[PDB]
Amino acid sequence: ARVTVQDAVEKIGNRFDLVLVAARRARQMQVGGKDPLVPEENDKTTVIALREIEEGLIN
Amino acid sequence: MVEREEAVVWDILDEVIREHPVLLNRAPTLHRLGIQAFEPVLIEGKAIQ
Amino acid sequence: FLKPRLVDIEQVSSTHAKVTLEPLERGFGHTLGNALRRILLSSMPGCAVTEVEIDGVLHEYSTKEGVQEDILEILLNLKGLAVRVQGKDEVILTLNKSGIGPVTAADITHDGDVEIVKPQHVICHLTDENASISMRIKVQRGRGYVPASTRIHSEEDERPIGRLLVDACYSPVERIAYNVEAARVEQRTDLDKLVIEMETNGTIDPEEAIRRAATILAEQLEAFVDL
Amino acid sequence: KPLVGTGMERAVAVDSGVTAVAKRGGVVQYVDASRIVIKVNEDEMYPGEAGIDIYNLTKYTRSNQNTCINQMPCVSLGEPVERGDVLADGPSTDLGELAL
Amino acid sequence: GVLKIVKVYLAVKRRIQPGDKMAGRHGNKGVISKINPIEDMPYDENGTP
Numbered sequence A: 001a002r003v004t005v006q007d008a009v010e011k012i013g014n015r016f017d018l019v020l021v022a023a024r025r026a027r028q029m030q031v032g033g034k035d036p037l038v039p040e041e042n043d044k045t046t047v048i049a050l051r052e053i054e055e056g057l058i059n
Numbered sequence B: 001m002v003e004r005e006e007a008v009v010w011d012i013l014d015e016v017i018r019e020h021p022v023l024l025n026r027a028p029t030l031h032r033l034g035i036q037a038f039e040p041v042l043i044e045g046k047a048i049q
Numbered sequence C: 001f002l003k004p005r006l007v008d009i010e011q012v013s014s015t016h017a018k019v020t021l022e023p024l025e026r027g028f029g030h031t032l033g034n035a036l037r038r039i040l041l042s043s044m045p046g047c048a049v050t051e052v053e054i055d056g057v058l059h060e061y062s063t064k065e066g067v068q069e070d071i072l073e074i075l076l077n078l079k080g081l082a083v084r085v086q087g088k089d090e091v092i093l094t095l096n097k098s099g100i101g102p103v104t105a106a107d108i109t110h111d112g113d114v115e116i117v118k119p120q121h122v123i124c125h126l127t128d129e130n131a132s133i134s135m136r137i138k139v140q141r142g143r144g145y146v147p148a149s150t151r152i153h154s155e156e157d158e159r160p161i162g163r164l165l166v167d168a169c170y171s172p173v174e175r176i177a178y179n180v181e182a183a184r185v186e187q188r189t190d191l192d193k194l195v196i197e198m199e200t201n202g203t204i205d206p207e208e209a210i211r212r213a214a215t216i217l218a219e220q221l222e223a224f225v226d227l
Numbered sequence D: 001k002p003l004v005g006t007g008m009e010r011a012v013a014v015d016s017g018v019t020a021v022a023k024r025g026g027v028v029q030y031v032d033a034s035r036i037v038i039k040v041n042e043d044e045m046y047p048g049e050a051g052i053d054i055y056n057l058t059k060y061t062r063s064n065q066n067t068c069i070n071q072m073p074c075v076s077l078g079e080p081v082e083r084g085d086v087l088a089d090g091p092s093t094d095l096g097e098l099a100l
Numbered sequence E: 001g002v003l004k005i006v007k008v009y010l011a012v013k014r015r016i017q018p019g020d021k022m023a024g025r026h027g028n029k030g031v032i033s034k035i036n037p038i039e040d041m042p043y044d045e046n047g048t049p
Helices: A006-011 A017-028 A045-055 B007-017 C028-041 C072-078 C206-219
Strands: B022-024 B036-038 C016-024 C045-054 C090-097 C101-103 C124-126 C133-146 C163-165 C168-170 C173-183 C191-200 D026-031 D035-040 D052-056
Touching: A006 A045, A017 A045, C016 C028, C016 C173, C016 C206, C028 C173, C028 C191, C028 C206, C045 C072, C072 C124, C090 C101, C191 C206
Parallel strands: none
Antiparallel strands: B022 B036, C016 C191, C045 C133, C045 C163, C045 C168, C090 C133, C101 C124, C133 C168, C173 C191, D026 D035, D035 D052
């Protein structure tokens, strides 16, 4: 589980458009799109997107 | 499924609550920082620890 | 190291006793003290009223001509029956009583497996001359605290609508507290002793009590050993 | 019962109507969980209508806040009563004392 | 109009649960909290915890 996502806040400073990014991304992981690369572990796709921001691979 | 307390939904329950950024909001707040967020956990009780 | 062991169990009564442990080493008076205390305080095999069918019952909240309280309060008394079984999973105790007098725990159909420890335990009264009561107290054995409320959602398909579901309080114990003091053996520098003052209404023998508890700890440690 | 009070404790329990009191004391006779019948003694009896005082009990019924008024019998069968004696006190009362 | 009517009562045994308001005749209020064990409470010369 995550205790501090301040890292995500720094990779993408918008903190708003950031939500629109993961917005369309959650859409891909649901309605066709593409499969979630990082093998998920209980964490819904919303949190999975959170993790992808911290790594900064998909923005 | 929820109607039968299926052991199935119990595991699934774990998956959707153990990591849910929720808004603990108190309606009568006369201040911005009175509305904050936490992370719910499967707790055996009758109140919000 | 001298193996942990209990000396002669200080027996003052059949219902309540206090185990005494002499060969206790540094900290075991407290180790086993609480490691047994908690289990002894909750999970223990007891016998409690599950379902009862009384005859003069339109509803459990009725005033049967001849009894001081509710029909359900007759069941309230039945909730803490001091019955002791020998092997049955469940057993039916018939209670028939007609005549001027307090319906004690002696007028019940005394079955061989049903061993009440306190015969004079008055449930309810039957004071009217030409009145009568007749019921069947279906008591079973379990452990812990299990209520018919958490069991009421099913109805269990009841044709004989006299089968009222009541609270199964399976706790023979009531008073478990441990004390400590200087124990002296012949070969050792310092040993601790343990005196667990346990109280049982009269369903499980004091030794069988500490027996079951210790055994359950053994099984709850089964899986705990594998890394 | 409350270990402390003021002296108005019996003024509540005994005189609140919560208990089937008696206006004319007498030997309790036909006491049931529904109604209590009292055979009146003549030193406290009015020669009218022989001598059978009828009383009704509040033995578990309904109440406003979804409540259920509860009466607790305090007197055992076989004993004369007095003008102002109780038979079965109401809720949170024992033999005539208010234990809210 | 009121000619084929029904009157039915339902009663429930209710015991105190965590969150009930207990207090005193003096002025101090209070609410029952987390259910606690029996003798984990300090006892005395009488024996009752």
